[PDB]
Amino acid sequence: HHHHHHMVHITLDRNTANSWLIISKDRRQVRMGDTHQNVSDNKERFSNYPMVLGAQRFSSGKMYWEVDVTQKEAWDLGVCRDSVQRKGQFSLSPENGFWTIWLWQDSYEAGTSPQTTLHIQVPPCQIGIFVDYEAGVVSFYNITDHGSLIYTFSECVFAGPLRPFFNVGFNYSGGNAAPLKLCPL
Numbered sequence: 310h311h312h313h314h315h316m317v318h319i320t321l322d323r324n325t326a327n328s329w330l331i332i333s334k335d336r337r338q339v340r341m342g343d344t345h346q347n348v349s350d351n352k353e354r355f356s357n358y359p360m361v362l363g364a365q366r367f368s369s370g371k372m373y374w375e376v377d378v379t380q381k382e383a384w385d386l387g388v389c390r391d392s393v394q395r396k397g398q399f400s401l402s403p404e405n406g407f408w409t410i411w412l413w414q415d416s417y418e419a420g421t422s423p424q425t426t427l428h429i430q431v432p433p434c435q436i437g438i439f440v441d442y443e444a445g446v447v448s449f450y451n452i453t454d455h456g457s458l459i460y461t462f463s464e465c466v467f468a469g470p471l472r473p474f475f476n477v478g479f480n481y482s483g484g485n486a487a488p489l490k491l492c493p494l
């Protein structure tokens with residue numbers, strides 16, 4: 310792809326984080342802690358899952374960023390509406406305001422309803438995410454495999470400002486402690 314010139318500097322919004330997450334000083338990395346991280350509750354925090362939003366809001370234009378997923382067993386990545394549900398149980402779908410892909414149990418899937426199987430020959434260590442607001446497109450790229458396309462959501466109905474979306478996943482196995490990291494431009 311040739312989307313690299315739309316690169317944006319994303320930072321994580323601490324206030325939106327699940328209370329078990331640990332965000333680095335530079336707000337560019339996040340991981341699952343082994344306990345509650347001693348923060349007050351608020352209406353923005355994702356309560357049920359290890360999720361956090363980017364601070365940036367997008368309502369126009371073309372945006373691109375990259376995320377490091379090295380040695381993780383489970384994660385979700387993409388964008389979501391600013392007004393997505395924070396509390397309780399929900400599925401990741403465009404109907405609920407999410408445009409995402411994930412790794413789970415050794416398979417990659419796009420967060421459609423129902424979910425779509427992805428075909429990845431080279432397990433990615435870094436993912437590129439491209440949003441074209443006006444076109445209604447969210448695309449995912451395999452940076453480890455020379456930028457090859459993973460998935461495109463088209464005919465997106467954003468219906469609001471968009472925020473970068475992250476889920477570090479649970480660590481029931483002891484094999485998923487590694488962070489998500491926003492990669493430098």
Ligand SMILES: O=C(c1cn[nH]c1)N1CCCC1
Nearest residue numbers: 403404462463464465466467
């Ligand atoms: O944004 C949407 C959508 C949201 N509500 N209804 C449709 N889609 C992305 C892929 C095709 C459906």
